[PDB]
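Minimal example, chain plus nickel (II) ion.
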Amino acid sequence: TCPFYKKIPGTGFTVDAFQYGVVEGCTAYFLTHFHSDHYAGLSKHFTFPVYCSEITGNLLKNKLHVQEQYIHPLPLDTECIVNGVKVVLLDANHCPGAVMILFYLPNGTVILHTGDFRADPSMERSLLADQKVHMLYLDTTYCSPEYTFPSQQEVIRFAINTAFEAVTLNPHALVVCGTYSIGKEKVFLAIADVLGSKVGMSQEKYKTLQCLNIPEINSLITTDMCSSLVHLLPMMQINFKGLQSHLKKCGGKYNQILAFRPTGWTHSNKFTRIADVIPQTKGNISIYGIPYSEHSSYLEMKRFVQWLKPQKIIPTVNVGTWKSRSTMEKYFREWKLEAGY
Ligand code: NI
């Protein structure tokens, strides 16, 4: 049955609620972003109105074959009316096409649903600054103080210099980057760019990236693996067995793999700086786990909330255990007391 934190009070609306079948009384189904835990349930047989960004709409149409007449894409930063309720989509700084949703209820309440986000000070200067928010449905993925990680910029810098140095030392080295969904494109694209290569990938992945309105993407990606020295593979293949195997397939074009696993968080962050990251190496294969997150750190989250000062917070992640829920409510009270709201 649909959980309460996927329902928008005082409306017919749900958010990311597609795996429950017909939700009783739901007149519009909103989708924040094209990730499987959020979209699970959509297909060509879905006949209710879906509201989303243009990018997420491209992916519904082309990847899941949802019929066009049920896809209702909205522009960002624009006041729109859905079944008589004013709404706005804002950039979530997550994966391509990911949004937060502002709801203006007829009775005067204002609700922000963050979807999945990585909080940033730039959000303090969007349409959010213009009015008060009474309820916040918050992406609490990493809502605990142990979760620190570097900026996206610092991580990409590390990856670019690592890859450029390896390939300049050995021109027969191949670079491989793991993926399992949209998001984190900057990792493989930045590396390709510094090396003067295109990124080679499967036809299904190339199709996915073509849905995203990336500038000059036809210039950066390709399905011709032969012409490319950066390859994208599924994340599951990013291990010594998987990479030895793939290296076999390259026909003696390459004698060495350098591979990147962009992970969310890993416990080497409590100790290790980005400067001090090292690979796991076996034979002529090295694997780097790098902490490229598309979710808020604890501190980025705390700042955002202390800036917004909502009257009520409703967490949407890590809600399945009493110890989790209870710990999060304790942090919310600290933040509120410390900021004075
Ligand atoms: Ni997500």
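Residues 1-147+296-341 form a domain with the Metallo-beta-lactamase; Chain A fold (CATH 3.60.15.10). Residues 33, 35, 94, 116 surround nickel (II) ion (CB under 6 Å).
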